[PDB]
Coordinates of C-alpha atoms and ligand atoms in Angstrom, one line a residue:
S1 CA 0.1 -27.5 -79.4
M2 CA -2.7 -25.0 -80.1
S3 CA -1.9 -21.5 -78.8
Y4 CA -5.4 -21.4 -77.4
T5 CA -8.5 -23.7 -77.1
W6 CA -11.8 -21.9 -76.7
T7 CA -15.1 -22.9 -75.1
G8 CA -17.3 -20.4 -77.0
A9 CA -17.9 -18.2 -74.0
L10 CA -17.3 -14.5 -75.1
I11 CA -14.5 -12.2 -73.9
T12 CA -16.7 -9.7 -72.1
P13 CA -16.1 -6.0 -71.3
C14 CA -15.8 -5.0 -67.7
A15 CA -17.7 -1.8 -68.3
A16 CA -19.2 0.4 -71.1
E17 CA -16.9 0.7 -74.1
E18 CA -16.8 3.6 -76.5
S19 CA -15.5 2.9 -80.1
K20 CA -16.1 6.3 -81.8
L21 CA -14.0 9.3 -80.9
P22 CA -15.8 11.4 -78.3
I23 CA -16.0 15.1 -79.3
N24 CA -16.0 18.1 -77.0
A25 CA -15.4 21.8 -77.5
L26 CA -11.7 21.2 -77.9
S27 CA -11.6 18.4 -80.4
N28 CA -11.8 20.5 -83.5
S29 CA -8.8 22.6 -82.5
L30 CA -6.7 19.4 -82.8
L31 CA -8.2 17.6 -85.8
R32 CA -11.3 17.6 -88.0
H33 CA -11.6 14.1 -89.5
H34 CA -13.1 12.6 -86.3
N35 CA -14.3 9.4 -88.1
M36 CA -10.7 8.5 -88.7
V37 CA -10.2 7.7 -85.0
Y38 CA -11.5 4.8 -83.1
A39 CA -10.9 2.7 -80.0
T40 CA -10.9 -1.1 -80.1
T41 CA -13.5 -2.9 -77.9
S42 CA -14.5 -6.4 -76.9
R43 CA -16.9 -6.4 -79.9
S44 CA -13.9 -7.3 -82.1
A45 CA -12.4 -9.8 -79.6
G46 CA -13.7 -12.7 -81.7
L47 CA -11.7 -11.6 -84.7
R48 CA -8.6 -11.4 -82.6
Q49 CA -9.1 -14.9 -81.2
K50 CA -9.3 -16.2 -84.7
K51 CA -6.0 -14.5 -85.6
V52 CA -4.1 -15.6 -82.4
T53 CA -5.3 -19.3 -82.5
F54 CA -3.0 -21.7 -84.4
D55 CA -0.8 -24.7 -84.0
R56 CA 2.9 -24.2 -83.2
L57 CA 5.7 -26.5 -84.4
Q58 CA 9.4 -26.2 -83.6
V59 CA 12.5 -27.7 -85.1
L60 CA 15.5 -26.8 -82.9
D61 CA 19.0 -27.1 -84.4
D62 CA 22.5 -26.7 -83.0
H63 CA 22.7 -23.0 -83.6
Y64 CA 19.7 -22.7 -81.4
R65 CA 21.4 -24.7 -78.6
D66 CA 24.8 -23.0 -79.1
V67 CA 23.2 -19.6 -78.5
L68 CA 21.2 -20.8 -75.6
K69 CA 24.3 -22.2 -73.9
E70 CA 26.0 -18.8 -74.3
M71 CA 23.0 -17.0 -72.8
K72 CA 23.0 -19.3 -69.8
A73 CA 26.7 -18.8 -69.2
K74 CA 26.0 -15.0 -69.0
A75 CA 22.9 -15.6 -66.9
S76 CA 25.0 -17.6 -64.4
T77 CA 26.9 -14.4 -63.5
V78 CA 23.7 -12.8 -62.4
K79 CA 22.7 -12.6 -58.7
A80 CA 19.1 -11.6 -58.0
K81 CA 17.4 -10.8 -54.8
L82 CA 14.0 -11.8 -53.5
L83 CA 11.9 -8.7 -53.0
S84 CA 10.0 -8.3 -49.7
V85 CA 6.2 -8.2 -49.6
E86 CA 6.3 -4.4 -48.8
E87 CA 8.8 -3.7 -51.6
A88 CA 6.6 -5.7 -54.1
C89 CA 3.6 -3.8 -52.9
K90 CA 5.2 -0.4 -53.5
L91 CA 5.7 -1.4 -57.2
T92 CA 1.9 -1.8 -57.7
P93 CA 0.0 0.8 -59.8
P94 CA -2.4 2.8 -57.7
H95 CA -5.1 1.8 -60.2
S96 CA -4.0 -1.8 -60.9
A97 CA -7.0 -4.2 -61.2
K98 CA -8.4 -5.1 -57.8
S99 CA -8.0 -8.7 -56.4
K100 CA -10.9 -11.1 -56.5
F101 CA -10.1 -11.8 -52.9
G102 CA -11.4 -8.7 -51.2
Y103 CA -8.8 -5.9 -51.7
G104 CA -7.4 -3.5 -54.3
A105 CA -4.2 -1.8 -55.4
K106 CA -4.7 0.9 -52.8
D107 CA -4.9 -1.7 -50.0
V108 CA -1.7 -3.2 -51.3
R109 CA 0.2 0.1 -51.6
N110 CA -0.9 0.8 -48.0
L111 CA 0.4 -2.6 -46.8
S112 CA -3.2 -3.3 -45.5
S113 CA -3.2 -6.4 -43.3
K114 CA -5.9 -8.0 -45.5
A115 CA -3.8 -7.5 -48.7
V116 CA -0.5 -8.5 -47.0
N117 CA -2.1 -11.6 -45.5
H118 CA -3.5 -12.8 -48.8
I119 CA -0.3 -12.2 -50.6
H120 CA 1.5 -14.3 -48.0
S121 CA -0.9 -17.2 -48.5
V122 CA -0.5 -17.0 -52.2
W123 CA 3.3 -17.1 -51.8
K124 CA 3.0 -20.1 -49.5
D125 CA 0.8 -21.9 -52.0
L126 CA 3.3 -21.2 -54.7
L127 CA 6.1 -22.9 -52.7
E128 CA 3.9 -25.9 -51.8
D129 CA 2.1 -26.5 -55.1
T130 CA 4.1 -26.5 -58.4
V131 CA 1.4 -28.1 -60.7
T132 CA -2.0 -26.5 -60.3
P133 CA -2.8 -24.1 -63.1
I134 CA -3.4 -20.6 -61.9
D135 CA -6.5 -18.7 -63.0
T136 CA -6.2 -15.8 -65.4
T137 CA -8.6 -13.1 -66.6
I138 CA -8.8 -12.5 -70.3
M139 CA -10.0 -9.0 -71.5
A140 CA -10.0 -7.1 -74.8
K141 CA -7.9 -4.0 -74.6
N142 CA -9.4 -0.6 -75.4
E143 CA -6.8 1.1 -77.5
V144 CA -7.0 4.1 -79.9
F145 CA -5.9 4.1 -83.5
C146 CA -6.4 5.9 -86.8
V147 CA -8.2 3.8 -89.5
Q148 CA -6.3 1.6 -92.0
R149 CA -9.7 -1.1 -88.3
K150 CA -7.7 -3.6 -86.2
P151 CA -9.3 -5.9 -83.7
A152 CA -8.7 -5.4 -80.0
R153 CA -5.6 -7.1 -78.5
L154 CA -6.1 -9.6 -75.7
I155 CA -4.6 -9.0 -72.3
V156 CA -4.3 -12.1 -70.0
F157 CA -3.4 -11.6 -66.3
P158 CA -3.4 -13.4 -62.9
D159 CA -5.0 -12.0 -59.7
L160 CA -3.3 -9.0 -58.0
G161 CA -2.0 -11.3 -55.2
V162 CA -0.2 -13.5 -57.7
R163 CA 1.2 -10.3 -59.4
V164 CA 2.7 -9.1 -56.1
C165 CA 4.2 -12.6 -55.7
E166 CA 5.7 -12.4 -59.3
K167 CA 7.5 -9.2 -58.3
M168 CA 8.9 -10.7 -55.1
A169 CA 10.3 -13.7 -57.0
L170 CA 11.2 -12.0 -60.3
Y171 CA 11.3 -8.2 -60.2
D172 CA 15.0 -8.1 -59.6
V173 CA 15.6 -10.8 -62.2
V174 CA 13.7 -9.2 -65.1
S175 CA 15.2 -5.9 -64.1
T176 CA 18.8 -7.1 -64.3
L177 CA 19.1 -10.3 -66.3
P178 CA 18.3 -9.1 -69.8
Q179 CA 21.2 -6.5 -70.0
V180 CA 23.7 -9.1 -68.7
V181 CA 22.6 -11.8 -71.2
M182 CA 22.3 -9.6 -74.2
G183 CA 24.6 -6.7 -73.5
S184 CA 24.3 -3.7 -75.9
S185 CA 21.6 -5.6 -77.8
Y186 CA 19.0 -5.2 -75.0
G187 CA 16.9 -2.2 -76.1
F188 CA 15.1 -1.2 -72.8
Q189 CA 18.4 0.0 -71.3
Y190 CA 18.4 3.0 -73.7
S191 CA 16.7 6.4 -73.6
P192 CA 15.5 7.5 -77.1
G193 CA 18.8 9.3 -77.6
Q194 CA 20.9 6.4 -76.6
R195 CA 18.9 4.2 -78.9
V196 CA 19.7 6.5 -81.8
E197 CA 23.3 6.5 -80.7
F198 CA 23.5 2.8 -80.6
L199 CA 21.8 2.4 -84.0
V200 CA 24.0 5.1 -85.6
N201 CA 27.3 3.7 -84.2
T202 CA 26.3 0.2 -85.1
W203 CA 25.3 1.3 -88.6
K204 CA 28.7 3.1 -88.9
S205 CA 30.6 0.0 -87.7
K206 CA 29.9 -1.9 -90.9
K207 CA 31.8 -1.5 -94.1
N208 CA 28.5 -1.8 -96.2
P209 CA 25.6 -1.6 -93.7
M210 CA 22.3 -3.3 -94.3
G211 CA 19.6 -3.7 -91.8
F212 CA 16.0 -4.8 -91.3
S213 CA 13.3 -5.0 -88.7
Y214 CA 11.7 -8.4 -88.3
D215 CA 8.0 -8.5 -87.4
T216 CA 7.0 -11.8 -85.9
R217 CA 3.3 -12.5 -86.5
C218 CA 1.4 -12.4 -83.2
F219 CA 4.6 -13.1 -81.2
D220 CA 2.9 -14.0 -78.0
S221 CA 1.0 -16.8 -79.7
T222 CA 4.2 -18.2 -81.3
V223 CA 5.8 -18.7 -77.9
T224 CA 5.6 -22.4 -77.1
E225 CA 5.8 -24.5 -73.9
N226 CA 9.4 -25.3 -74.9
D227 CA 10.2 -21.6 -75.2
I228 CA 8.8 -20.9 -71.7
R229 CA 10.7 -23.7 -70.1
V230 CA 13.9 -22.6 -71.8
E231 CA 13.2 -19.1 -70.4
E232 CA 12.9 -20.6 -66.9
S233 CA 16.2 -22.6 -67.4
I234 CA 17.8 -19.2 -68.0
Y235 CA 16.3 -17.6 -64.9
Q236 CA 17.4 -20.5 -62.9
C237 CA 21.0 -19.9 -64.0
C238 CA 21.1 -16.9 -61.7
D239 CA 22.4 -17.0 -58.1
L240 CA 19.1 -17.1 -56.3
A241 CA 17.6 -17.6 -52.9
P242 CA 16.1 -21.2 -52.5
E243 CA 12.6 -19.7 -52.1
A244 CA 13.0 -17.7 -55.3
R245 CA 13.9 -20.8 -57.3
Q246 CA 10.9 -22.6 -56.0
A247 CA 8.6 -19.7 -56.7
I248 CA 10.0 -19.3 -60.2
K249 CA 9.6 -23.0 -61.0
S250 CA 6.0 -22.9 -59.6
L251 CA 5.0 -19.7 -61.5
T252 CA 6.4 -21.2 -64.7
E253 CA 4.5 -24.6 -64.4
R254 CA 1.3 -23.0 -63.1
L255 CA 1.1 -19.7 -64.9
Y256 CA 3.7 -18.8 -67.5
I257 CA 3.4 -22.0 -69.6
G258 CA -0.4 -21.8 -69.8
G259 CA -3.6 -21.8 -67.9
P260 CA -7.4 -21.5 -67.9
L261 CA -8.9 -18.2 -69.2
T262 CA -11.8 -16.6 -67.4
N263 CA -13.8 -13.6 -68.7
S264 CA -15.0 -10.6 -66.7
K265 CA -18.3 -12.4 -66.0
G266 CA -16.6 -15.5 -64.5
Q267 CA -17.1 -17.9 -67.4
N268 CA -14.4 -20.2 -68.6
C269 CA -13.4 -18.9 -72.0
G270 CA -10.8 -21.6 -72.7
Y271 CA -7.2 -22.4 -72.3
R272 CA -3.8 -20.7 -73.1
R273 CA -0.7 -22.6 -74.1
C274 CA 1.4 -19.6 -75.2
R275 CA 2.7 -16.4 -73.7
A276 CA 0.4 -14.5 -71.3
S277 CA 0.4 -10.8 -72.2
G278 CA -0.1 -9.6 -68.7
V279 CA 2.5 -11.2 -66.5
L280 CA 5.7 -9.7 -65.0
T281 CA 8.0 -11.8 -67.4
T282 CA 6.2 -10.9 -70.6
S283 CA 8.7 -8.3 -71.7
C284 CA 11.8 -10.1 -70.4
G285 CA 10.6 -13.5 -71.7
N286 CA 9.8 -12.1 -75.1
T287 CA 13.1 -10.2 -75.3
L288 CA 15.2 -13.3 -74.4
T289 CA 13.2 -15.6 -76.7
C290 CA 13.3 -13.1 -79.6
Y291 CA 17.0 -12.6 -79.1
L292 CA 17.7 -16.3 -78.8
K293 CA 15.8 -17.2 -82.0
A294 CA 17.1 -14.3 -84.0
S295 CA 20.7 -14.9 -82.9
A296 CA 20.5 -18.5 -83.9
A297 CA 18.7 -17.6 -87.2
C298 CA 21.5 -15.1 -88.0
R299 CA 24.0 -18.0 -87.8
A300 CA 21.7 -20.3 -89.8
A301 CA 21.4 -17.6 -92.6
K302 CA 25.1 -16.9 -92.6
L303 CA 24.6 -13.2 -92.0
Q304 CA 27.9 -11.3 -91.8
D305 CA 28.5 -9.6 -88.4
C306 CA 24.8 -9.4 -87.5
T307 CA 24.2 -6.9 -84.6
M308 CA 20.8 -6.9 -83.0
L309 CA 18.6 -4.6 -81.1
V310 CA 15.7 -6.3 -79.3
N311 CA 12.9 -4.9 -77.3
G312 CA 10.4 -7.6 -76.3
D313 CA 9.0 -9.0 -79.6
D314 CA 10.4 -6.0 -81.5
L315 CA 13.5 -6.9 -83.5
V316 CA 15.9 -5.1 -85.7
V317 CA 19.1 -6.4 -87.3
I318 CA 22.0 -4.5 -88.7
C319 CA 24.7 -6.5 -90.6
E320 CA 27.5 -6.4 -93.2
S321 CA 25.9 -6.4 -96.7
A322 CA 26.9 -8.9 -99.4
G323 CA 25.0 -7.2 -102.3
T324 CA 21.3 -6.6 -102.7
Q325 CA 20.8 -10.1 -104.2
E326 CA 22.7 -12.0 -101.5
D327 CA 20.9 -9.9 -98.9
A328 CA 17.5 -10.9 -100.2
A329 CA 18.6 -14.6 -100.1
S330 CA 20.0 -14.5 -96.6
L331 CA 17.0 -12.7 -95.2
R332 CA 14.8 -15.3 -96.8
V333 CA 16.8 -18.1 -95.1
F334 CA 16.8 -16.0 -91.9
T335 CA 13.0 -16.0 -92.1
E336 CA 12.9 -19.7 -92.8
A337 CA 14.9 -20.3 -89.7
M338 CA 12.8 -18.1 -87.5
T339 CA 9.8 -19.9 -88.8
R340 CA 11.3 -23.3 -87.9
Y341 CA 11.8 -21.8 -84.4
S342 CA 8.2 -20.8 -84.3
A343 CA 8.7 -17.1 -85.0
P344 CA 7.0 -16.8 -88.5
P345 CA 6.8 -13.3 -90.0
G346 CA 3.8 -11.1 -90.3
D347 CA 5.1 -8.7 -92.9
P348 CA 8.0 -10.3 -94.8
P349 CA 11.3 -8.6 -93.9
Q350 CA 13.1 -6.4 -96.4
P351 CA 16.7 -5.3 -96.5
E352 CA 17.3 -1.6 -96.1
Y353 CA 20.3 0.4 -97.0
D354 CA 19.2 3.7 -95.4
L355 CA 19.1 3.7 -91.6
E356 CA 16.4 6.3 -91.7
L357 CA 14.1 3.8 -93.5
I358 CA 14.3 1.2 -90.8
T359 CA 11.4 1.2 -88.3
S360 CA 11.9 -0.6 -85.0
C361 CA 9.8 0.0 -81.9
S362 CA 7.5 1.8 -84.2
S363 CA 10.3 4.4 -84.5
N364 CA 13.1 5.4 -86.8
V365 CA 16.2 7.6 -86.8
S366 CA 16.1 10.9 -88.6
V367 CA 18.3 14.0 -88.7
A368 CA 17.8 17.7 -88.1
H369 CA 20.1 20.6 -87.2
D370 CA 20.7 22.3 -83.9
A371 CA 21.2 26.0 -83.2
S372 CA 24.7 25.7 -84.6
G373 CA 23.7 24.2 -87.9
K374 CA 25.2 20.9 -87.0
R375 CA 23.5 17.6 -88.0
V376 CA 21.9 15.9 -85.1
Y377 CA 20.2 12.5 -85.0
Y378 CA 17.1 11.8 -83.0
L379 CA 14.2 9.4 -82.7
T380 CA 10.9 10.1 -84.3
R381 CA 7.9 8.1 -85.6
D382 CA 4.8 8.3 -87.8
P383 CA 2.6 10.7 -85.7
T384 CA -0.7 9.1 -86.7
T385 CA -1.3 7.0 -83.6
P386 CA 0.1 9.6 -81.2
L387 CA -2.3 12.2 -82.7
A388 CA -5.3 9.8 -82.7
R389 CA -4.6 9.1 -79.0
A390 CA -4.2 12.8 -78.2
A391 CA -7.5 13.5 -79.9
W392 CA -9.1 10.9 -77.6
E393 CA -7.3 12.4 -74.6
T394 CA -8.6 15.8 -75.6
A395 CA -12.2 14.8 -74.7
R396 CA -11.5 12.0 -72.2
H397 CA -9.3 11.5 -69.2
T398 CA -7.6 8.1 -69.4
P399 CA -5.4 6.1 -67.0
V400 CA -2.4 6.5 -69.3
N401 CA -1.8 10.0 -70.7
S402 CA -0.1 9.0 -74.0
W403 CA 0.3 12.7 -75.0
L404 CA 2.6 13.2 -72.1
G405 CA 4.6 10.1 -72.6
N406 CA 4.9 11.0 -76.3
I407 CA 6.2 14.5 -75.5
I408 CA 8.8 12.9 -73.2
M409 CA 9.9 10.3 -75.7
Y410 CA 9.6 12.3 -78.9
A411 CA 10.5 15.8 -77.5
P412 CA 12.9 16.7 -80.4
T413 CA 10.3 15.9 -83.1
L414 CA 8.6 18.4 -85.4
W415 CA 5.2 17.0 -84.5
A416 CA 5.5 16.6 -80.8
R417 CA 6.7 20.2 -80.4
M418 CA 4.4 21.9 -82.9
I419 CA 1.3 20.0 -81.9
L420 CA 1.3 18.0 -78.6
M421 CA 3.2 20.6 -76.6
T422 CA 1.1 23.5 -77.9
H423 CA -2.2 21.7 -77.6
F424 CA -1.9 20.3 -74.2
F425 CA -0.1 23.2 -72.5
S426 CA -2.9 25.4 -73.9
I427 CA -5.5 23.1 -72.2
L428 CA -3.5 22.9 -68.9
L429 CA -3.3 26.7 -68.8
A430 CA -7.0 27.1 -69.4
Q431 CA -7.8 24.6 -66.7
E432 CA -5.1 25.8 -64.3
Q433 CA -3.7 22.3 -64.0
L434 CA -0.1 22.9 -64.8
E435 CA 1.2 21.4 -61.6
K436 CA -1.1 18.4 -61.4
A437 CA 0.9 15.2 -61.7
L438 CA -0.3 12.9 -64.5
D439 CA 0.4 9.2 -65.1
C440 CA 2.0 7.9 -68.3
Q441 CA 4.0 4.8 -69.3
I442 CA 7.6 4.5 -70.5
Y443 CA 8.6 1.1 -71.7
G444 CA 5.5 -0.3 -70.0
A445 CA 6.3 1.1 -66.5
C446 CA 3.9 3.7 -65.1
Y447 CA 5.2 7.0 -63.9
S448 CA 3.6 10.0 -62.2
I449 CA 4.8 13.2 -63.9
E450 CA 4.2 16.9 -63.4
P451 CA 4.0 18.7 -66.8
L452 CA 6.0 21.7 -65.4
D453 CA 9.0 19.4 -65.1
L454 CA 9.0 18.7 -68.8
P455 CA 11.8 21.2 -69.7
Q456 CA 14.1 19.5 -67.1
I457 CA 13.1 16.0 -68.2
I458 CA 13.6 16.8 -71.9
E459 CA 17.0 18.4 -71.3
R460 CA 18.2 15.5 -69.2
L461 CA 17.0 12.8 -71.7
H462 CA 17.6 14.6 -75.0
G463 CA 20.0 17.5 -74.3
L464 CA 19.5 21.2 -75.0
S465 CA 19.3 20.6 -78.7
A466 CA 15.7 19.2 -78.3
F467 CA 14.6 22.8 -78.0
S468 CA 16.4 24.1 -81.1
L469 CA 16.1 21.4 -83.8
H470 CA 15.1 22.7 -87.2
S471 CA 15.6 22.0 -90.9
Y472 CA 14.1 18.5 -90.4
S473 CA 14.5 16.0 -93.3
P474 CA 12.4 16.0 -96.5
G475 CA 11.1 12.5 -95.6
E476 CA 10.2 13.5 -92.1
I477 CA 8.5 16.7 -93.2
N478 CA 6.6 14.8 -95.9
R479 CA 5.3 12.2 -93.4
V480 CA 4.2 14.8 -90.9
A481 CA 2.4 16.7 -93.8
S482 CA 0.7 13.6 -95.0
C483 CA -0.5 12.7 -91.5
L484 CA -1.9 16.2 -90.9
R485 CA -3.9 16.1 -94.1
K486 CA -5.2 12.6 -93.4
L487 CA -6.4 13.5 -89.9
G488 CA -7.3 17.1 -90.8
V489 CA -5.0 18.9 -88.4
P490 CA -4.6 22.7 -88.6
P491 CA -1.5 24.0 -90.4
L492 CA 1.8 25.4 -89.0
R493 CA 0.5 29.0 -89.0
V494 CA -2.2 28.1 -86.5
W495 CA 0.1 26.2 -84.2
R496 CA 2.7 28.9 -84.2
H497 CA 0.1 31.5 -83.3
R498 CA -1.2 29.2 -80.5
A499 CA 2.3 28.6 -79.3
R500 CA 3.1 32.3 -79.1
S501 CA 0.0 32.7 -77.0
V502 CA 0.7 29.7 -74.8
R503 CA 4.3 30.9 -74.4
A504 CA 3.3 34.4 -73.4
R505 CA 0.9 33.0 -70.8
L506 CA 3.5 30.7 -69.3
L507 CA 6.2 33.3 -69.1
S508 CA 3.8 35.5 -67.1
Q509 CA 3.2 32.6 -64.6
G510 CA 6.8 32.7 -63.6
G511 CA 8.9 29.9 -62.1
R512 CA 8.8 26.5 -63.9
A513 CA 5.9 27.6 -66.1
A514 CA 8.1 30.4 -67.3
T515 CA 10.8 27.9 -68.1
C516 CA 8.3 25.8 -70.0
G517 CA 7.4 28.8 -72.1
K518 CA 11.0 29.7 -72.7
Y519 CA 12.3 26.3 -73.8
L520 CA 9.3 24.4 -75.1
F521 CA 8.2 27.2 -77.4
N522 CA 11.4 29.0 -78.5
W523 CA 10.7 27.6 -81.9
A524 CA 7.5 29.8 -82.2
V525 CA 9.2 33.2 -81.9
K526 CA 11.3 34.9 -84.6
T527 CA 13.9 36.3 -82.2
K528 CA 15.0 33.1 -80.4
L529 CA 16.1 33.1 -76.8
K530 CA 19.5 32.0 -75.4
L531 CA 18.4 28.8 -73.9
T532 CA 20.9 27.3 -71.4
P533 CA 21.0 24.5 -68.8
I534 CA 18.6 24.3 -65.9
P535 CA 19.3 23.9 -62.1
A536 CA 16.4 21.8 -60.9
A537 CA 17.2 19.3 -63.7
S538 CA 19.9 17.4 -61.8
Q539 CA 17.4 17.1 -59.0
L540 CA 15.1 14.7 -60.9
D541 CA 16.0 11.1 -60.1
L542 CA 15.8 9.5 -63.5
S543 CA 17.4 6.2 -62.3
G544 CA 15.1 3.3 -63.3
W545 CA 13.5 5.1 -66.3
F546 CA 15.4 3.3 -69.0
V547 CA 16.6 0.1 -67.3
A548 CA 14.2 -2.6 -68.4
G549 CA 10.9 -3.2 -70.2
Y550 CA 7.8 -4.0 -68.2
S551 CA 4.9 -4.0 -70.7
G552 CA 2.0 -5.8 -69.2
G553 CA 4.1 -6.2 -66.1
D554 CA 1.9 -4.1 -63.7
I555 CA 4.9 -1.9 -62.7
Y556 CA 4.6 1.5 -61.1
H557 CA 7.3 4.1 -60.1
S558 CA 6.8 7.3 -58.0
Ligands
LIG1 C1 11.6 24.1 -85.8 C2 10.2 23.9 -85.6 C3 9.7 23.0 -84.5 C4 8.3 22.8 -84.3 C5 7.4 23.5 -85.0 C6 7.8 24.4 -86.0 C7 9.2 24.6 -86.3 S1 9.5 25.8 -87.6 O1 8.3 26.4 -88.1 O2 10.5 26.8 -87.1 N1 10.4 25.1 -88.9 C8 9.8 24.0 -89.6 C9 8.4 23.8 -89.8 C10 8.1 22.6 -90.6 C11 6.8 22.1 -90.9 C12 6.6 21.4 -92.2 C13 5.4 20.8 -92.6 C14 4.3 21.0 -91.7 C15 3.0 20.4 -92.1 N2 2.0 19.9 -92.5 C16 4.4 21.7 -90.5 C17 5.6 22.2 -90.1 S2 9.5 21.8 -91.0 C18 10.6 23.0 -90.3 C19 12.0 22.9 -90.2 O3 12.7 23.7 -89.5 O4 12.6 22.0 -91.0

């Protein structure tokens, strides 16, 4: 079973692609080493195809089936509802790819008769046909990174009408099933703070903690037909409407298991027999499968009290240590098991004895001190990619504003506060666009957010301490310092000066802007302000923010 079979037709761009960092009058204020930043384009799609194309083999033992049986028992307690066409339509991103059948995301959100009519015919076809492969478009993603250059990732997705149908049949399932089956181990239920909390408590629950992150190589490509049918067997355990069962069975046989791949020009590029990266079940399916294989592998390797944290293909394990030597051996067996399950490693896993040294979801726990001098744990990450992307967003408006999402998710960090907040608020002020709502993604779901609500959002998600953290760790400070030199970012003295200016301007604006100045930049003044809770905060309806993962799921919220 080859993950893909190719015809030779190229994966074509659907419009002009820029690979070099665009420079405008603001670029240099952020970073000077422009040649360090690049965007991937279809030009490197061939290289990716080569990496993701391989044969998969699977040897499934009793630990695998024992864990599966447990997962199904939990899945059987779940009751999921079939979404209505209109409900499904409302979950569609305003700029989601237009259908090939005469309508776009806008027509869908408006419940246009044409869109609704087509969606209804697609649904009917799903119920009547459970064998015909469904077409998919394959595109090379345009993503920004800082040099070592990686090839573009491949996104595979069905037509907009099919996507609306996926939500109707499975939105409720993928939104609720994961937490029930995996409990505390399901990562997408946590906000950054709760993640840290879970990690710290788990780490503290062991007598001699040891943990590791396990990077599966090209996870989507390792997912086999068996894996995808086992995922369906789990979904089918739920209490479901008869029409939902049929739709899920049909989507599994016709789309999830595999299908023909068409490029932007309409040519047949080949065939997929692995996970599609752009379907509704990509995150839920990967999480269930990663959790299933890892849980079984933990038993096979005889890991003592293995606790796991899984987010899609991202996996981190914290267990009871048995000595550095015994640990190396177990992890080696754990890896051998995952490999037999068709989840071979990219970077071999290594045991860690310092929670701060474990990277999962590209992040790690670190510690700082609040205004009281108390140690506080928070989530941070290497700022390289976030800064490379902010550089790009400094000269170009993009669909997803990573700078805003990073400020939200990494609000307590030294780098998000010193740089992203200062840099972008400065630009927003200058352009008088403080109150303009911008789109960003959180766990794959798209949200429309007004920058002026940041203080409230940050307090809600991270607590007041996010505005007073200081005395960061030596390791964290060193990483930030190294990153700034690499990219050529101005030093602290420059950002503090800019922040004071930005703050002063915001305070003068009054209202929310004043609050932004007050809380977001209190770190810049020598005589710190009081800083206390905020009224409007409780108004924000943050329900749904950290419930489930939807990467590639074409999901949008207010
Ligand atoms: C607390 C805070 C938050 C955001 C920006 C600046 C500050 S601060 O200057 O007050 N204090 C602090 C500034 C730090 C810093 C260290 C290295 C580099 C580089 N290259 C930039 C800034 S570390 C720190 C600390 O408190 O541990």
